[PDB]
Scaffold this motif. Structure first.
Motif, PDB file in Angstrom:
ATOM      1  N   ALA A 170      -2.349   3.510   2.088  1.00 12.78           N
ATOM      2  CA  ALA A 170      -2.904   2.171   1.917  1.00 12.78           C
ATOM      3  C   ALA A 170      -1.852   1.234   1.347  1.00 12.78           C
ATOM      4  O   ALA A 170      -1.677   0.105   1.821  1.00 12.78           O
ATOM      5  N   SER A 171      -1.119   1.688   0.324  1.00 16.19           N
ATOM      6  CA  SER A 171      -0.057   0.896  -0.238  1.00 16.19           C
ATOM      7  C   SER A 171       0.951   0.478   0.821  1.00 16.19           C
ATOM      8  O   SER A 171       1.364  -0.679   0.865  1.00 16.19           O
ATOM      9  N   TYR A 172       1.347   1.419   1.663  1.00 18.31           N
ATOM     10  CA  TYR A 172       2.318   1.155   2.704  1.00 18.31           C
ATOM     11  C   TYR A 172       1.814   0.135   3.722  1.00 18.31           C
ATOM     12  O   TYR A 172       2.565  -0.733   4.201  1.00 18.31           O
TER      13      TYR A 172
ATOM     14  N   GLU B  69      13.443   1.449  -8.708  1.00 17.49           N
ATOM     15  CA  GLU B  69      14.652   0.820  -8.226  1.00 17.49           C
ATOM     16  C   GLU B  69      14.813   0.924  -6.727  1.00 17.49           C
ATOM     17  O   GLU B  69      15.141  -0.030  -6.051  1.00 17.49           O
ATOM     18  N   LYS B  70      14.589   2.149  -6.203  1.00 19.39           N
ATOM     19  CA  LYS B  70      14.748   2.363  -4.762  1.00 19.39           C
ATOM     20  C   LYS B  70      13.739   1.545  -3.980  1.00 19.39           C
ATOM     21  O   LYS B  70      14.054   1.000  -2.896  1.00 19.39           O
ATOM     22  N   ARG B  71      12.497   1.511  -4.433  1.00 15.55           N
ATOM     23  CA  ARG B  71      11.461   0.723  -3.771  1.00 15.55           C
ATOM     24  C   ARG B  71      11.819  -0.744  -3.782  1.00 15.55           C
ATOM     25  O   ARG B  71      11.663  -1.452  -2.770  1.00 15.55           O
ATOM     26  N   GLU B  72      12.334  -1.240  -4.902  1.00 14.91           N
ATOM     27  CA  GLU B  72      12.803  -2.630  -4.969  1.00 14.91           C
ATOM     28  C   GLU B  72      13.908  -2.886  -3.962  1.00 14.91           C
ATOM     29  O   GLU B  72      13.940  -3.943  -3.295  1.00 14.91           O
ATOM     30  N   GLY B  73      14.831  -1.949  -3.802  1.00 15.10           N
ATOM     31  CA  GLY B  73      15.856  -2.063  -2.786  1.00 15.10           C
ATOM     32  C   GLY B  73      15.297  -2.175  -1.390  1.00 15.10           C
ATOM     33  O   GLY B  73      15.804  -2.962  -0.571  1.00 15.10           O
TER      34      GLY B  73
ATOM     35  N   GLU C  57       0.279  -7.793  -3.710  1.00 12.44           N
ATOM     36  CA  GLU C  57      -0.448  -7.387  -4.914  1.00 12.44           C
ATOM     37  C   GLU C  57      -1.185  -6.083  -4.680  1.00 12.44           C
ATOM     38  O   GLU C  57      -1.108  -5.146  -5.492  1.00 12.44           O
ATOM     39  N   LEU C  58      -1.906  -5.991  -3.571  1.00 13.10           N
ATOM     40  CA  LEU C  58      -2.656  -4.798  -3.228  1.00 13.10           C
ATOM     41  C   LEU C  58      -1.775  -3.598  -2.997  1.00 13.10           C
ATOM     42  O   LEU C  58      -2.149  -2.448  -3.318  1.00 13.10           O
ATOM     43  N   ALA C  59      -0.570  -3.809  -2.441  1.00 12.19           N
ATOM     44  CA  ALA C  59       0.344  -2.663  -2.310  1.00 12.19           C
ATOM     45  C   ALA C  59       0.623  -2.031  -3.666  1.00 12.19           C
ATOM     46  O   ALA C  59       0.662  -0.823  -3.813  1.00 12.19           O
ATOM     47  N   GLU C  60       0.838  -2.902  -4.660  1.00 13.23           N
ATOM     48  CA  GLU C  60       1.083  -2.455  -6.011  1.00 13.23           C
ATOM     49  C   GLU C  60      -0.127  -1.701  -6.567  1.00 13.23           C
ATOM     50  O   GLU C  60       0.031  -0.619  -7.155  1.00 13.23           O
ATOM     51  N   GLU C  61      -1.318  -2.271  -6.407  1.00  9.29           N
ATOM     52  CA  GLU C  61      -2.527  -1.648  -6.897  1.00  9.29           C
ATOM     53  C   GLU C  61      -2.743  -0.260  -6.338  1.00  9.29           C
ATOM     54  O   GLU C  61      -3.070   0.671  -7.046  1.00  9.29           O
ATOM     55  N   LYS C  62      -2.568  -0.139  -5.004  1.00 12.06           N
ATOM     56  CA  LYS C  62      -2.784   1.160  -4.359  1.00 12.06           C
ATOM     57  C   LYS C  62      -1.782   2.182  -4.857  1.00 12.06           C
ATOM     58  O   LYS C  62      -2.121   3.375  -5.049  1.00 12.06           O
ATOM     59  N   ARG C  63      -0.524   1.795  -4.987  1.00 12.49           N
ATOM     60  CA  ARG C  63       0.508   2.695  -5.493  1.00 12.49           C
ATOM     61  C   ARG C  63       0.188   3.133  -6.903  1.00 12.49           C
ATOM     62  O   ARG C  63       0.326   4.319  -7.255  1.00 12.49           O
TER      63      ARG C  63
ATOM     64  N   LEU D 186       1.553  -5.512   5.800  1.00  8.56           N
ATOM     65  CA  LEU D 186       0.767  -6.748   5.846  1.00  8.56           C
ATOM     66  C   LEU D 186       1.479  -7.869   5.120  1.00  8.56           C
ATOM     67  O   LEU D 186       1.610  -8.989   5.606  1.00  8.56           O
ATOM     68  N   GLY D 187       1.984  -7.566   3.903  1.00 11.75           N
ATOM     69  CA  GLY D 187       2.618  -8.599   3.091  1.00 11.75           C
ATOM     70  C   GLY D 187       3.823  -9.188   3.790  1.00 11.75           C
ATOM     71  O   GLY D 187       4.009 -10.415   3.859  1.00 11.75           O
ATOM     72  N   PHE D 188       4.697  -8.344   4.305  1.00 14.78           N
ATOM     73  CA  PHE D 188       5.874  -8.841   4.964  1.00 14.78           C
ATOM     74  C   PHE D 188       5.570  -9.498   6.278  1.00 14.78           C
ATOM     75  O   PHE D 188       6.279 -10.431   6.659  1.00 14.78           O
ATOM     76  N   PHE D 189       4.525  -9.086   6.982  1.00 14.75           N
ATOM     77  CA  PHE D 189       4.181  -9.793   8.245  1.00 14.75           C
ATOM     78  C   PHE D 189       3.850 -11.241   7.958  1.00 14.75           C
ATOM     79  O   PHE D 189       4.297 -12.141   8.671  1.00 14.75           O
TER      80      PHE D 189
END
Lengths: 167, 167, 167, 167, 167, 167
Positions: E25-27, F56-60, E52-58, E32-35
């Motif tokens: 889901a995070s992925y 860090e890697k994810r930020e990259g 934001e949701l990517a962060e939440e799911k992770r 979605l975010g980058f699209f």
């Protein structure tokens, strides 16, 4: 023990007994505190008075245990016997039980002091004098005062005492 | 009792047993704490770890007693049995004893939860879940971590663990 | 409903009923509050106690309505029935009526929980446990305590309770 | 009643009716508020507008109840009838219903004032003038303004009104 | 494992699966975010909502991994499958995909809860209830609200929603 | 794409590959972090070191995705392969695996730079130089230092390194 000095086995054993007696008193106060918090008793100030005392007695036990170690004795723990009653009556009756318990504890502390005097252990004597004997005198006095007031107000009076003297 | 509602006698008795088991654990931690404060043991961080736990366990007992009253049950106190040992060995051995004690306490808490489920007492279930079950999981995990480290460092290592991990 | 998931029609209807029961309780407390503010009753602390509870009960209804929407159910409102009495008697009698009302409300909440368990709706169960069940236990306990005190003080006593306990 | 003075039974009964009408309006606004919070309605500003009004109407009822007691009348509560609709339509339709309800409430307040004038109750008249009549005029004006805007924007327009006027 | 207690292998495996589903889901939300940040899409508020949701799911995955360790299970990682689409359409279509994904995730969480109930793992049940189930209900509700608004505004409307609701 | 300028398809594809490689590294560090948090591993500083690196890697990866969009390329996501091991050994072995992974990632970044040079994409080259290449050099140096220390201390030594160097 590399540290032990002028510390009799008689005193060491009596310290352990006095730890137990403090824990017993603490436990009794726990019971008293929760009884007065029953919905069918419901005297908050009374409960809080006793709960405070549970803490005090436990602190007294802990300080004796530190003393034991500081002098090179061995702490030995015994069961903490359940309190003498499951139900504690009206405030006056409970307070009378607490007074008797404190006088018994004070006697035990005076007996330990007398043993320290007999064994010429001035460090023990000073420890008791500084941290226990005046605490017992002041608390016993306070309980006496409360009992006098409880008698003076003697159901409405019991409510008023909780409201106006206790928390 | 004017307040009692959906509160089984089975749960009421089991609460009283769980108060006692918490007090027993607290007492065990008191003993552990003072053993590590002996001049011939002298591991301050270990003593403080266990003394903290004595406080935690006692608080757990007190919270159960409040629960008992809040639900209209009667607190009934039993003797607090002395701890299983008078001397606790090296840090690892003591920590192993603490882990076993906590797992036993956790099982008792899970058993009480199962009883609450069987008697359809969701307030009991939530009380345990909110204030006990995760505390036991987190503490047991911490003890596991400590044991792993104690094994990793295995006399100098025991000193270093007290200095560098404890606290 | 695009959001609805694991939300039974049985639970949805019971939520609506429990909204109504909370509003009924709130309304009863409104009546209680204003009765004690009558010039010929004039027990401010009693009035304020009940007015506070009117607010609490209404908040409970509102939180259930939010829950209904959050789960994709439909809020359906029914008449809020007038309270059972127009005059509420002495403080003790009023407090007895409030206790009975709260026990009835608590039973309704426990019944809804049991339904959630039967329908395997853990979100409902957690909602009730987190925001309702302990509130009802604590309030019922408080009312019990107050009744015990009211009985202990039993006209002057009723004044004193309002002055010294209420708020 | 020891306090009652220049307070007619006709006014006392009409006050009780006006309490009920305020509670009915409050209840209607509760329903309106939660309808607009449905996931399939989802107009937060509209919901909040109505929820605010539920509070206002309830406060109006409470102030009338205080007045009743202050004058020595007896508060008598009737059922609060459920609102006229279960579903409230688009924002404009809901706002039209609210306007009609407020005009009805205002008429009831004007009728009570006329009764106070006829019975020569200037304290009643001043109470209404000071706390109700201008509130109703200002609110009705605001609702008119909103309706005009809703008509001006007439689905995208309804979203924009919620976003830009409400919230 | 020295810590493991009342922790079934069935639950342990299902936890690992639920970690993976959260990472998936995070992925998806990353994609979605980058699209929505593409120059030819350019809906900043939409992109930020999904990021934001990517962060939440992770975070949800990480919390499950901690849980696994806290209970004495073994974290086992599987590939994180690429999201279902490379391009996500208009805001409404993307939001519909997110809603379906969240409902699927919520079902998986409810299934794990049911397993915990069946295996009498109240610590698991409380963990899910406290940190996951209400989060899923609230998020799903929010997505429903957004979809309703997106439908209400239905190109200019999509811009306005991003500007005025998102963010 | 209206914005695209001097941005080769070869670079666009390689950026997508380098996003994936960063996500793979991040995932590996997640696994490393949680392994060291196992109760039977229990090296907090090691876990935290690796968890930091996951971030860090994810930020990259995220910064590369922004770059892709900024240049008018299309982000395309592939599965994130599970890490190479389920269990990571002692700290030194884990650190050796991390060093090898970072050197592989650095090579991939150098290869992308060489491609940018060959395609005369100075904006790409500067992006890598400014945000990636020195980060990889500094991190690889740090890992080398840690490995040297781990070798110097080589079970007690591993504990001490976690305590005194990590965190």
């Amino acid at each position: 023990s590399q540290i032990r000095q002028n510390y009799s086995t008689e005193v060491e054993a009596a310290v352990n007994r006095l730890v137990n007696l403090h824990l017993r008193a603490s436990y009794t106060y726990l019971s008293l505190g929760f009884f007065f918090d029953r919905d069918d008793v419901a005297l908050e100030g009374v409960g809080h008075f006793f709960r405070e005392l549970a803490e005090e007695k436990r602190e007294g036990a802990e300080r004796l245990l530190e003393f034991q170690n500081d002098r090179g004795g061995r702490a030995l723990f015994q069961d903490v016997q359940k309190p003498s009653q499951d139900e504690w009556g009206k405030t006056q009756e409970a307070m009378e039980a607490a007074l008797a318990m404190e006088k018994n504890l004070n006697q035990a502390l005076l007996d330990l002091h007398a043993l320290g005097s007999a064994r010429a252990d001035p460090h023990l004597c000073d420890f008791l004098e500084s941290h226990y004997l005046d605490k017992e005198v002041k608390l016993i006095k306070k309980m006496g005062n409360h009992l006098t007031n409880l008698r003076r107000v003697a159901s409405l009076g019991e409510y008023l005492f909780e409201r106006l003297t206790l928390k």
